[PDB]
Amino acid sequence: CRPVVRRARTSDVPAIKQLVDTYAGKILLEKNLVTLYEAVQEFWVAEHPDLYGKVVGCGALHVLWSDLGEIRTVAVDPAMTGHGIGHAIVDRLLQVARDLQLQRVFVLTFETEFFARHGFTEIEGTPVTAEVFDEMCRSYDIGVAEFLDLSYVKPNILGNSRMLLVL
């Protein structure tokens, strides 16, 4: 299995949404269409080569600061799991992270083994509320960035695990 992983187009957003909706709830955070469209340039999709490039998976990398990214919304069609599509997507995202000149990537996930294959290690966060987080983000600049590591404080909504990768 050699999925093609490529940058998303607006035309893939429906398939992305469908993927999210499959797992949305206590596993993945819900996303509406407008949110996805706006984020489209963060998104990569996996194609099924034998099936004419049909989209069977997705993932996103979101930039927080000059040195830090977060992987989000990685999902694979439940009928296509276990063939390396997932790992392919993550591989791509990490390369993008490198190309962008990021130094670290974090993720919030229940799939700790999956991510551990990529070198992610579980860390103990200091999560805050959404409100506190919004305060932090509003103040965020060079000075604040000196002492505040967003990877540690990013809210944990689903109650999953926090993991970190040093590029």
Ligand X SMILES: N[C@@H](CCC(=O)O)C(=O)O
* Site residues for ligand ACO per CB under 6 A: 1, 23, 27-28, 71-76, 81-87, 107-111, 113-114, 117
Please, are residues 167 and 105 in contact by the beta-carbon 8 Å criterion? yes
Is residue 104 involved in binding a copy of itself (CB under 8 A)?
A: no
Q: Which does 9 bind (CB under 5 to 8 A by kind): a copy of itself, ligand X, ligand ACO, none?
A: a copy of itself
Q: Which does 85 bind (CB under 5 to 8 A by kind): ligand X, a copy of itself, ligand ACO, none?
A: ligand ACO
Contacting ligand X within 49-88 (CB under 6 A)? 60, 62, 72-73
Is residue 12 involved in binding ligand X (CB under 6 A)?
A: no
Is residue 109 involved in binding ligand X (CB under 6 A)?
A: no
CA angle 149, 154, 160 (to 5 degrees): 125
| Cα–Cα separations (whole angstroms), residue 77 to 52, 72, 82, 157 | 16, 16, 10, 23
Residue of the chain from 24, 27, 39, 144 that contacts ligand X (CB under 6 A): 39
Of 79 and 142, which CB lies nearer to a copy of itself in the complex structure? 142
Of 37 and 81, which CB lies nearer to a copy of itself in the complex structure? 37
Residue 156: how many other CB atoms lie within 10 Å: 13
Tell me the HSE value of 83 on the side-chain side, using a 13 A CA sphere. 16
Q: What are phi and psi of 4, to 5 degrees?
A: -90, 125
DSSP classification of residue 137: H
Please, are residues 106 and 68 in contact by the beta-carbon 8 Å criterion? yes
Question: What residue has token string 């505040």?
Answer: 148
Stretch binding a copy of itself (CB under 8 A), from 18-26, 34-42, 49-57, 78-86: 34-42
- Number of chain positions touching ligand X (CB under 6 A): 8
Binding site for ligand X (CB under 6 A): 31, 35, 39, 42, 60, 62, 72-73
